[PDB]
C-alpha cells in the first residue's frame, strides 16, 4: 500500500520495499513524506552482530525527516492537514526532569519505557509516509525547502548542542577544531563561525573535504595526519584549543583531540568511532572538561532552523529518489558523498 | 635565623631545621605564619621516585598558608603591616586570558615561564616566615581564626571550585556523590549544602569518618565497598547522580564514579588517585561530561572564607606544633587524622 | 452538582456555591482537590474596577493545586487514576520556544491564543473538582502532604525561579534581601539558605512576621521603616546586596531596593505593589539588573517539590474549610495569616 | 616639555597646549602614544556645569589609548621597552571581588579610594605621551595596527561586555535590536553578527549611517521613527526583539527600546543619554530585563582585540592630527564622523 527503505536480515543491505501505509492512532500524525536525511549512523547500525542488535527486524530507516501533515490522529490539536514540518527526532517520556527542559534527548527513563526515535526503532521517514507519536515532536517550517534542511534535524542539531554547550568554555577570539567535515562535520563548521568568536580549524583525509571545509567558512583545513598535532599547537601559541569536537571519535582522532585541548578546555565527542578519552590527572590537562553529547533539545532544533531563515547556516546537499537509496547508503560508507544525501519520495 | 619543615632527600622523611629568614625582594611580602595547613598532595610528591620529582631540594613545604603581614618589600603597596591575610596558592603570571579572570590556576603560560606555587615549589608556609610573590596573592581575613580557616585555601577552596562548575548540571533537589570525607571532602560535604540543593551521599572506609560526614550534613554516608553502586542506584531512582565528586580519584573510585553518574550528569575528579575515566560512547553516559578541576580562583577563594564568616562551613582541625610536623604526616598517611592537619608556629 | 468559592460581582467578595460537576473533555484531566491555595493576587484581581477585569464572572478562585487524578478524558494517558498530582499553574501554548524550554511562564504566543491559568481565568482549585488542560501540566507528589506542600506551586515556585535566575549574579557569600515575609516571602526566605551562599536580610512590618522570618533561617530581620537602608548599607561594607528580591513591589519598596543593590548587583521585582523601579545611569548602578519576574518552568517547580521531599524547605500552613475561604480572604488581605492560608475540601 | 589636548575652563572647548613630559613613579609605565580615541562620553563631560564636573582642570582628555612603551617605572616588570599595547581604561582597586575576576569595572571600592580612568580624572591618552598606573591595566597587540584598533578599548569593549552578558536571553536564530550606529553601534553592530545568532536590526537618523550598519552585516537598518516600533513587532512575528541595545539611552531611545522588548528579553541601556526605563510590572514585560552596563572585563578586552586579529570585527577609523583634535570634536558633535575619530600624535 506504499513503498519504503528497510533493514530486513542481519549483515544485509537496506531494500526498498512496498508495505502497508499506517493510520494515525490517538494523539498522533501521519506525514507525506517530503525529505530524508540519510546519517552515518544509519551505517554504524547496520554492520553490528546479530546480538548487539535491538530495533527489530524489520526496520523503516532514516532519522532525518520532514513533511507535511498528511492526516490527523483522535484527538490532536496543534497542527493542520498541510503544515510544512521537521520531525524532532530523540523521543522522550516527555514528563521527566530533561523532557520538561526540552531535552528529550536527555531523557531518564526512556531505555526503561522502550521508547526509541524513528529510523532507530520506530517507523522511520525514508517512506512515502510516516507517522509521529505526538505534536511536540514537529517543528513548523513556514517555507524552507525539506531538501535543504531536513537533515538540520540532526546533522544541524547534534554539533549545534555540542557547541551551544562548549561555549561556557569557547570563549570569542578563542580557536575550534572540527575534527571531521562530513555530514555534520561541514554543518558544525558554519555553526562555530555564526555563533562562537573562534577561529574553526577543520581536518579530514581527502583534499576534495578540506575545500569544500576551507569554502564553508573554516580559517584553516588540514590533514588529520601525525603533523595534525603540531600544526595546531603552532597554530595557537603552544596553547591548544579552548574546543575540540570529534566528529569521528574513533580512538585516534579522540589521541589528537586529548593531545591538543587547551588547559580548562573541552572535548565533545561527536561521533562514533568506538574510542575513549582516557579523562583524568596527566592524561586530560587541567579543567579539561569531556563529554559524549548526544543530538539535542527541542528548543535547539528551533534555534537551528531559525538560523537556516536567516542564512546563517545551510546544508550541502545530494539529492537522490527512493530507489536510489540503497546506492547512496554504499556512496556513503565509501565516504564519497559530498555534505548530506538526502531522499526525496 | 628562622626554623622550617623541609623535604631534602629522595625518599626520605621531613625534617624540621634552621635556614635562613627571608627578606622580600621589590614587589614581596613577608608573613609571620599564624597557620599552615598539610594536604595529602604534600605526601604524593614525596612518595616519587628521583626522576618524577622537579621541586628542588631542599624544599620547605606546605601551600595552605595564613598569618600576618611582617615586613614589605620595595615599592609594594596594597597591604599594611599587621594585616591578617591567607595565601591564594596557585600562582600564575598575572597577564593571560585565564589570569585576568582571577584563574591563576589555569593559567596557560605558567609552566613555561617556571612559575610555581609555596609548598610546590617555591618556599612554603610550614616555616616561621614566608614570601608571597606578590599583593594579588593575599586575600584579608579580617578576624577569622587563622587556625580555623587556613585549610579553606584549598581543602575548602578545591571542592568549591569543583562543585560551582558543576552546578550547571546539578539542580536543586538532585544527588551528588562525594567519595572521600577527608580534608578536603569533608568541607566539600559542607559546601555542597551550603550552594546546592542537591542531597549529598558521603563515602569513605572507616565508618569513623562516615560519622563525620553525616555530622557534617551529609543525607547518606555509605561504605566504598562492592554495594556502594547498587545503594546509590536504590537511592536515585535508577538514575543515578546528577554529580559526583571524586575525591580519592583512584581507579577503583573512578569506576564506581562512572557507574553511578546520570545521563546528563557531571563527574568531577578531584583527587589524584593515578587512576583515568573512559570517558566515551558506551563507557560515560549520553550527555555525561568529566574532568579534572585544580585549585580555584582567586574570587572563589574569597567566596569561601565569606562562607566561613557567614557560618555556613567550617574546618575540623587537628592542631599540632612545628616540631610535631613530620609525626602529623605519619599521621595523615596512615589515615587516622580527622579533618585537616594544621600547624601553628 | 458540586460546591466552589467563586468571583461573581465585581467589587463584591467570594462566596461558596453549588455548580455542576466538570467532565474532562480529550486531552484533560479531573482532580479531586485535596488543598488549594490562597495567594494575595487573588485578592488584587478582585479589588479591580470592571474596565480592568478580564476573567469573566463568574470564576471560580485558586491557582494552587494539588489532588487526586479522579476521572481522565479521551485518550489521556501519563498518569493513572489514583496519582497524586500538583498542578502547574502558568499555562502555555506548549509548542513555541519558550514553551520548549519548559518556560510555560514566558509563553510568547499565550495572550493571542487567550490560554489562561486555572484561577486566573479556567476554573481554578478551589472546589471539590477542577480539570487541568493537559498531562504535562500535572507533577507527581508520591508521598508529600498535599496541604503541606501545594503552595510550592507558585508560593514556592515564583521566588525559586526569581532567586535560581540571580545566581548568576549572587556569589556565595553575598547578600540578599528579601522585602516581605508574606506566603512567598517566608519560602524565598527558605531557598535562598538551601541554595544561595548568600546572608539573607528579610524585611517586614509586623514583629510578629520578623521573627518567623527570622525562625525560618533569615540571617538578620529588620522593619522595613527609613532606617531600612542605613542598615542594609552598615551591613554590608558601604556596598549594599548583590540580590533584592522585593516581594512587595511597590513604589516605596522598589525605592529601597534602587537605594542597597550592589554595583553590578541585581533586583527581581517579584511583588506586584503598583510601582516602577527608573533603570538607568545615575538610576540605579552600573551593572545593576533590573526584572519583573513571573512565576517559574516546568522543571523548576519539579525541583521545589524535590527540595520539599528533601526536607530544605516548607510551607508554614494555616488550614481553613471549603467554607471558611471568604473569611480567610478577609484575613489575608487584614495581613494577619503566618504564611500561606490552604483550604481543603 | 610634551604636548596635549585639554579641557581647562569650564563650558570651553578643548585646547592643544604644552606641558611637562610625565616621569613613571614605582609600578607605572610610560607609553609613546600611536593613537588616540575620540568617545562621545568625552563630549557629556564638556557640557556639565561646574558643580557637576569633578576630574579638576586641567584634565588631558582620551581615554582610549594605545602605544609603545616609552619608560619602565621602578620595580616594573611584565612588559619591556618597544613593546605594542593597549590601556584597559576602567581602572579599579585590583583586590575586591569583582576587580579579582578581571571586572575592574565593576569595582565596589574604587569611588571610595578616588580611582579614575585615563582621560576621565587622570592624565588621558590625547598626548605625545601618557603614564599607566600598572601593569595590568596594559594588553598586548602584538602586530595590530593601533589607529585601526585603538577605538576596541571602549568601542568595542563596551557593547561587547554587554552584548556577552544578554547572550543568556539572545538564542541564536533570536532578534537584537541596536538603537544607534554611531562609534559604538557600528562595532555593536559587527559583534553582535559574529558571535550571537541573532538577525541585528540597527536604527539611526542619518541615511549614510543606516546604509554604513548595513554594510557591516545589519540585516535591516531603519529610521528610530514613530514607524520604528511597528517595524521591529512586524519583523518579529508580534512578539518583539529578544536584545535590545539602546547606544543612545535617551527618554525616546529607552521608550522604544520598551515597547519593542520580548518577554523574557533584556534590554541593556548602553548609551548615556539623560533617561531612565520604568521597569517593572506592566511597564515591562514578564520576564524583561533592564540593565546600565559599563565599560568591560580585562579578559573582554583581550576577546574583542583577538576578534580584531580574526578578522571578524574592525572600526572605520576617520584619521586626524593632534592639531584637529578640537574640531574632531566639533565634527562628533555635529555628529558628521562616520565611525570613531582617531587621532595619532
Ligand atoms: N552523538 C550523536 O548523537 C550523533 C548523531 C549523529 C551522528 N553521529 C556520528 O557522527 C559521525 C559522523 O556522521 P556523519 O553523518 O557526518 O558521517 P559522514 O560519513 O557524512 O562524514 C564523516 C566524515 O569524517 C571524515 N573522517 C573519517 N575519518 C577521519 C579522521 N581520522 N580524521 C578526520 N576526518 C575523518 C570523513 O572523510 C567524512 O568527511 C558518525 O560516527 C555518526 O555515527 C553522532
Ligand atoms: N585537584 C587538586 O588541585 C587537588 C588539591 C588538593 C588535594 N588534591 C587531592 O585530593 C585527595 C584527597 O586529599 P586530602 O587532603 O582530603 O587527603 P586526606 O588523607 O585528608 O583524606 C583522604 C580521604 O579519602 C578516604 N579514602 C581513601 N580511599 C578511599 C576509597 N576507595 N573510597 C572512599 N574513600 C576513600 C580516606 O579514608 C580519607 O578520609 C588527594 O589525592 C590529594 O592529592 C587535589
Ligand atoms: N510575580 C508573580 O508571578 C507573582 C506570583 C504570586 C504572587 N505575586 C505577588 O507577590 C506579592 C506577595 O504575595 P503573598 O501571597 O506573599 O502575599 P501575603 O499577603 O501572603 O504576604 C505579603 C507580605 O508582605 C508584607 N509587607 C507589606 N508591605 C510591606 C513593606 N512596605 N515592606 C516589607 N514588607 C511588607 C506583609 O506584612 C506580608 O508579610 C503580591 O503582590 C502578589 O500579587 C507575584
Ligand atoms: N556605558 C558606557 O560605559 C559607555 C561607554 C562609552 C560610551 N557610552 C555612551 O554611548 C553613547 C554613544 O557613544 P558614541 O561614541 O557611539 O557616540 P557617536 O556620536 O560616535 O554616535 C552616536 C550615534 O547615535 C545616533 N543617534 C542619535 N540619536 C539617535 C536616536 N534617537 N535614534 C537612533 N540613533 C541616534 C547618531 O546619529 C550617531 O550615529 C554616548 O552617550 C556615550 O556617552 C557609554
Ligand atoms: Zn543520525
Ligand atoms: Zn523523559
Ligand atoms: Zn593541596
Ligand atoms: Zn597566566
Ligand atoms: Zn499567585
Ligand atoms: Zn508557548
Ligand atoms: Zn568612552
Ligand atoms: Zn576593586
Same mark, same amino acid.
Given at each position: 500500500?506504499?513503498?519504503?527503505?528497510?533493514?530486513?536480515?542481519?549483515?544485509?543491505?537496506?531494500?526498498?520495499?512496498? !508495505? #502497508? +501505509? #499506517?493510520?494515525? @492512532?490517538? @494523539?498522533?500524525?501521519?506525514?507525506?513524506? /517530503?525529505?530524508?536525511?540519510?546519517?552515518?549512523?544509519?551505517?554504524?547500525?547496520?554492520?553490528?552482530?546479530?546480538?548487539?542488535? /535491538?530495533?527489530?527486524? #524489520?526496520? +523503516?530507516?532514516?532519522?532525518?525527516?520532514? @513533511? !507535511?501533515?498528511?492526516?490527523?490522529?483522535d484527538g490532536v490539536t496543534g497542527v493542520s492537514v498541510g503544515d510544512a514540518v521537521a520531525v524532532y527526532g530523540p523521543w522522550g517520556c516527555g514528563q521527566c526532569h530533561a523532557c520538561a527542559r526540552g531535552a528529550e534527548n536527555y531523557? +531518564?527513563?526512556?531505555?526503561?519505557?522502550?521508547?526509541?526515535?524513528?529510523?532507530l526503532g520506530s517507523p522511520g521517514a525514508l517512506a512515502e509516509y510516516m507517522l509521529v507519536d505526538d505534536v511536540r515532536h514537529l517543528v513548523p517550517l513556514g517555507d524552507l525547502d525539506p531538501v535543504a534542511t531536513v537533515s538540520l534535524t540532526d546533522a544541524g542539531l547534534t554539533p549545534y548542542h555540542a557547541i551551544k554547550s562548549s561555549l561556557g568554555a569557547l570563549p570569542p577570539g578563542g580557536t575550534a577544531?572540527?575534527?571531521?567535515?562530513?555530514?555534520?562535520?561541514?554543518?558544525?563548521?558554519?555553526?562555530?563561525?555564526?555563533?562562537?568568536?573562534? /577561529?574553526?580549524?577543520?581536518?579530514?583525509?581527502?583534499?576534495?573535504?578540506?575545500?569544500?571545509?576551507?569554502?564553508? @567558512?573554516?580559517?584553516?583545513?588540514?590533514?588529520?595526519?601525525?603533523?595534525?598535532?603540531?600544526?595546531?599547537?603552532?597554530? /595557537?601559541?603552544?596553547?591548544?584549543?579552548?574546543?575540540?569536537?570529534?566528529?569521528?571519535g574513533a580512538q585516534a582522532t579522540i589521541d589528537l583531540a586529548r593531545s591538543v585541548v587547551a588547559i580548562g578546555g573541552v572535548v565533545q565527542i561527536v561521533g562514533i568511532g568506538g574510542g575513549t578519552l582516557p579523562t583524568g590527572f596527566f592524561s586530560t590537562p587541567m579543567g579539561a572538561a569531556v563529554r559524549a553529547p548526544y543530538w539535542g533539545t527541542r528548543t535547539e532544533l528551533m534555534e537551528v532552523l531559525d538560523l537556516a531563515r536567516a542564512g546563517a547556516v545551510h546544508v550541502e546537499v545530494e539529492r537522490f529518489t527512493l530507489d536510489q537509496a540503497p546506492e547512496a547508503y554504499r556512496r556513503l560508507k565509501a565516504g564519497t558523498i559530498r555534505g548530506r544525501a538526502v531522499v526525496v519520495p
Amino acid at each position: 500500500h506504499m513503498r519504503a527503505v528497510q533493514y530486513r536480515t542481519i549483515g544485509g543491505e537496506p531494500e526498498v520495499v512496498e !508495505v #502497508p +501505509t #499506517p493510520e494515525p @492512532g490517538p @494523539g498522533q500524525v501521519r506525514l507525506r513524506v /517530503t525529505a530524508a536525511g540519510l546519517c552515518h549512523s544509519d551505517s554504524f547500525v547496520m554492520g553490528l552482530p546479530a546480538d548487539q542488535y /535491538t530495533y527489530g527486524l #524489520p526496520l +523503516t530507516l532514516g532519522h532525518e525527516g520532514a @513533511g !507535511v501533515v498528511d492526516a490527523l490522529g483522535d484527538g490532536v490539536t496543534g497542527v493542520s492537514v498541510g503544515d510544512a514540518v521537521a520531525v524532532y527526532g530523540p523521543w522522550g517520556c516527555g514528563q521527566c526532569h530533561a523532557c520538561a527542559r526540552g531535552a528529550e534527548n536527555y531523557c +531518564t527513563r526512556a531505555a526503561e519505557l522502550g521508547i526509541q526515535p524513528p529510523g532507530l526503532g520506530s517507523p522511520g521517514a525514508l517512506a512515502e509516509y510516516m507517522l509521529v507519536d505526538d505534536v511536540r515532536h514537529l517543528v513548523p517550517l513556514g517555507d524552507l525547502d525539506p531538501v535543504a534542511t531536513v537533515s538540520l534535524t540532526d546533522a544541524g542539531l547534534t554539533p549545534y548542542h555540542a557547541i551551544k554547550s562548549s561555549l561556557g568554555a569557547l570563549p570569542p577570539g578563542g580557536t575550534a577544531v572540527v575534527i571531521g567535515a562530513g555530514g555534520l562535520g561541514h554543518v558544525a563548521i558554519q555553526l562555530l563561525r555564526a555563533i562562537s568568536g573562534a /577561529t574553526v580549524i577543520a581536518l579530514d583525509i581527502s583534499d576534495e573535504k578540506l575545500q569544500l571545509a576551507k569554502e564553508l @567558512g573554516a580559517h584553516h583545513a588540514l590533514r588529520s595526519d601525525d603533523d595534525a598535532a603540531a600544526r595546531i599547537r603552532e597554530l /595557537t601559541g603552544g596553547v591548544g584549543a579552548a574546543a575540540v569536537f570529534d566528529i569521528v571519535g574513533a580512538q585516534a582522532t579522540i589521541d589528537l583531540a586529548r593531545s591538543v585541548v587547551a588547559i580548562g578546555g573541552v572535548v565533545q565527542i561527536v561521533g562514533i568511532g568506538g574510542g575513549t578519552l582516557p579523562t583524568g590527572f596527566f592524561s586530560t590537562p587541567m579543567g579539561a572538561a569531556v563529554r559524549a553529547p548526544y543530538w539535542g533539545t527541542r528548543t535547539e532544533l528551533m534555534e537551528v532552523l531559525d538560523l537556516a531563515r536567516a542564512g546563517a547556516v545551510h546544508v550541502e546537499v545530494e539529492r537522490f529518489t527512493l530507489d536510489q537509496a540503497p546506492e547512496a547508503y554504499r556512496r556513503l560508507k565509501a565516504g564519497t558523498i559530498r555534505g548530506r544525501a538526502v531522499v526525496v519520495p
